[PDB]
Ligand binder design. Structure first.
Ligand SMILES: [Cl-]
Ligand SMILES: [Cl-]
Lengths: 133, 6, 134, 6
């Protein structure tokens, strides 16, 4: 269970945001990507998998998951294949006017989400540390 | 002063 | 301290890579960015600070730190203001497996952070240090 | 088949 993540997409201002939720803790990684393509999705996962011990990613199994590039990146990295989107959009709306670019506002929301008080950021480290022990 | 353009 | 990170830059193929090292564990976060500018540097730090409990970030104090936008991002986030060679070595091992340098960098990050001798990896060490501190 | 273009 420590290794399990849920990947979803959400849309604001005509841009695409990918959201990875560490299921056991509620910790999130999110970013704006230029299009909801295999290649962009593969790169996001590769990034994630380098930062956390990612065993299984549950996805929506849509168009950006049927292709060769996601499959190759997951293989390499050893990854097996609405409240949250709404929560994140809520926070984004609270900070939006503080940033020129949506991408900045997203990362401010990530910060807020993960550090709000334990925090999610505290919970993920606790769960992984207990697992390594 | 924005977080990305101050 | 668990909260201390070192930020450096390195250059390959005409591109800029920013490397953040968690000093107590050797865990790294790295990204290709389009230019070594305040705005890009501020964004990278904002991103980092949302993912880990970042208290202090030691930087090279160069041109991309003298401006208004790093200072504003760091204020907001509450951050107070060998490895490059190692990372370029790993990038070279994987480079031909990727079209784009950015992908190779993230493969290198993965390798660096998950490599272990049997004892622990850097990814394991950072979690153990932050959890002990909580 | 590259990790970013297979
Ligand atoms: Cl998706
Ligand atoms: Cl720098």
């Amino acid at each position: 269970s420590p290794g399990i993540w849920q990947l979803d997409c959400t849309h604001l201002e005509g841009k695409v945001i990918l959201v990875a939720v560490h299921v056991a803790s509620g910790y999130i990684e999110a970013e704006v990507i230029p299009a909801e393509t295999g290649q962009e999705t593969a790169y996001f996962l590769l990034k994630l998998a380098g930062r956390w011990p990612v065993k299984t990613v549950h996805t929506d199994n849509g168009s950006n998951f049927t292709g060769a590039t996601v499959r190759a990146a997951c293989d390499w990295a050893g990854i097996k294949q609405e409240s949250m989107n709404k929560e994140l959009k809520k926070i984004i709306g609270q900070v939006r006017d503080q940033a020129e670019h949506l991408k900045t506002a997203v990362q401010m929301a990530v910060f807020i989400h993960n550090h709000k008080r334990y925090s999610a950021g505290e919970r993920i480290v606790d769960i992984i540390a207990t697992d390594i022990q | 002063c924005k977080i990305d353009n101050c």
